[PDB]
Structure 1
Amino acid sequence: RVKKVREMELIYARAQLELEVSKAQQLANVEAKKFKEMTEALGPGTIRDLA
């Protein structure tokens, strides 16, 4: 009884794994390329003086 349900919590957590994985993964792509274009369109000397 416990084996089967918890080997399933294995597969379910494998699932929840991948959910949290690609969740933060593409949230990361989001914010990282956000600030990519931010600072690239800014320019080296521009952001240097702004700071």
Structure 2
Amino acid sequence: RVKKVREMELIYARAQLELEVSKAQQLANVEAKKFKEMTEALGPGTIRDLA
């Protein structure tokens, strides 16, 4: 019993692992992309002089 279920919930959280990664990866990608678009959109110095 336990050997069977143990491999079930196992294989599951494994496919559900790369899913989480997929999510947090693409979202961190679109965030860094969106942010790279923000920074660029106003001067590389303009951000420094507003600082």
Structure 1: where are the runs of 5+ without partners? none
Structure 2: where are the runs of 5+ without partners? none
Q: Which has the higher helix share?
A: 1
The count of aligned residue pairs is 51
Measured against aligned partners, the alpha-carbon deviations of 1:5-31 in whole angstroms (never above 9, x if no partner) come to 111111101111011010101001110
| Alpha-carbon distance between aligned partners in 2 of 1:13 and 1:27, rounded to the nearest angstrom | 20
Percent identity for Structure 1 against Structure 2 = 100
| Alpha-carbon distance between aligned partners in 1 of 2:35 and 2:20, rounded to the nearest angstrom | 22
| Alpha-carbon distance between aligned partners in 1 of 2:36 and 2:44, rounded to the nearest angstrom | 12
User: Where in structure 1 do 4 or more consecutive aligned residues deviate above 3 Å?
Assistant: none
